[PDB]
Structures are given as structure tokens and as C-alpha cells.
Amino acid sequence: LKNVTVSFRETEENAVWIRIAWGTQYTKPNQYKPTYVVYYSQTPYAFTSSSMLRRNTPLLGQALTIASKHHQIVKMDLRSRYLDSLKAIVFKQYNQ
Amino acid sequence: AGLSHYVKLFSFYAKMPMERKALEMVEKCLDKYFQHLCDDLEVFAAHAGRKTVKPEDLELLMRRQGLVTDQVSLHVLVERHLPLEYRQLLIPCAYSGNS
């Protein structure tokens, strides 16, 4: 995806807040509907804004799992609107 | 005063809410409008060779502003915007005593 505006923001909770504006080589990067990816820094779990689920989603996971030195990216199939609750669930951080 | 009259009339002429900061700049627009007009009436009345500014001295100017045409003459333009007691002074009515 040669024309993308990837903008990171290392938050203070130690979780890089990637934002990706997509666009193929034929088009300019589209900032109308970006795909924010909240990758917790050294965590195997990397939240993702389920914007459109295009052909970039298997490239979103692929780039995520190759940037962080992992090998397999799996959609957990956890899909919630409350990221502050997904953070609790996937980390078991809510009852502790 | 009169500039405040026109900015208030702007409200009922733009049919849409604006900002006061827009109004003091349209005040400079009216000030420059006169800064072009009163010396445009100056030069047009001098072009006619007359010291005073007769109504036809301004009809030519409004022809310059493209608002008087062969379709829209001077007097018809008075119909559409000026009130009756004011156009009674401008466009000649008839009583066998046309104004």
C-alpha cells in the first residue's frame, strides 16, 4: 500500500496508537475512513478499528505481525465498541 | 448609524446569520464604496459638465455597475427596492403634475 499516511502516537499507557489512512497505488491515501490500530506495545493483542474490512485487513494483520516480531496474526473475533473494555477483556484486567 | 442601518438590512438581505466581525469589515466596504462612489459621481457629473449631480448623472453610473440595462432601466430599479413614499420623489408619477 504505497500511498498510506501511517501516523503513530506512543501513548502513556505503553500502547502505540497507530492510525492508518488507506489508499491503493491508484489513489491518494483516504483520510475520510482511516483504520486506527491500537497495538499494545509488547502485547500479542493488537486492537483494530473495524472500518471497512477490505483487502488491507489481511495486510493490516500482516504488517502488524511482521513489524512486531511475531509470525501469526489472528483476529480474536472480539468486536466491541468500548476499547477500554476490550483492553480489560483481552488482558483479563477488569477483575484485578 | 447608516452603516449600522445597512448591516442590519444586510441581515434581512442575506437571509442568513453572520458575525459582527463581518459587519465592521462590511463597514469598511461601505466606506470604500463611498470612496469610489462620491468621486465616481464627482467624475461623472464633471463628465456631463454640470456642478450638481442630477438623477441622470447617477443613471449612467448605475449603467456602469450593470444594474441599469435596456431591460432594467433606472426607474424599474426603484420599484423593486425603495419604499413608496421614497420612490414618489424619484420616479415621476402623474397628476398632470408629474414629479
Binding site: - | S73, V76, E79, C93, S96
Partner: protein, 87 residues
């Protein structure tokens, strides 16, 4: 039929006065006497028209029956006149 004759005589009252009192107005310097100019407007509105004078002359007169509300200018092409549609 009685209402027909009554309305007809009311018409010959109004129009007789339109001949008489309009000599208090009375024509002056083709122009077209305001009786004739008015009745040319009135004939046109009777069957519809928006032109009705195609800018009849003596401009003091054409704008006379415009300020009092007798006639109306065409809202788009203001060289043609209509008689305000009192119908």
C-alpha cells in the same frame, strides 16, 4: 336576468365615470390617453397576458397605474405590464 341588468348598469356607471372623472385626469403631451392605455391593459387581462402594453408610452402614465397597484410589472422582463389580476 335582473342581476345581469343590474351588474351591466353598474358597469356602465363605473365606466361612465371612467370616461368622466378621467377627464379630470385627462390626456396631455402618441402617448395613448390613460383611458385608452388602461382599457388596452384591461382587455388583455380579461383573457390573459403580462404584456398588455409592451411598455406603453408617456412613462409618467405607465408608472402611474403601477404605484397605486393598478398594474404590475413582469417580475423577470420589466418592459411588459400586467393589470394586477384583480379577478
Amino acid at each position: 336576468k335582473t342581476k345581469m341588468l343590474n351588474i351591466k348598469e353598474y358597469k356602465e356607471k363605473l365606466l361612465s365615470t371612467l370616461g368622466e372623472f378621467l377627464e379630470d385626469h385627462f390626456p396631455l403631451p402618441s402617448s395613448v390617453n390613460l383611458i385608452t392605455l388602461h382599457e388596452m391593459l384591461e382587455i388583455l387581462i380579461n383573457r390573459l397576458p403580462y404584456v398588455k402594453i409592451s411598455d406603453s408610452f408617456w412613462p409618467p402614465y405607465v408608472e402611474l397605474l403601477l404605484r397605486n397597484g393598478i398594474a404590475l410589472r413582469h417580475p423577470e422582463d420589466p418592459t411588459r405590464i400586467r393589470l394586477e389580476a384583480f379577478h
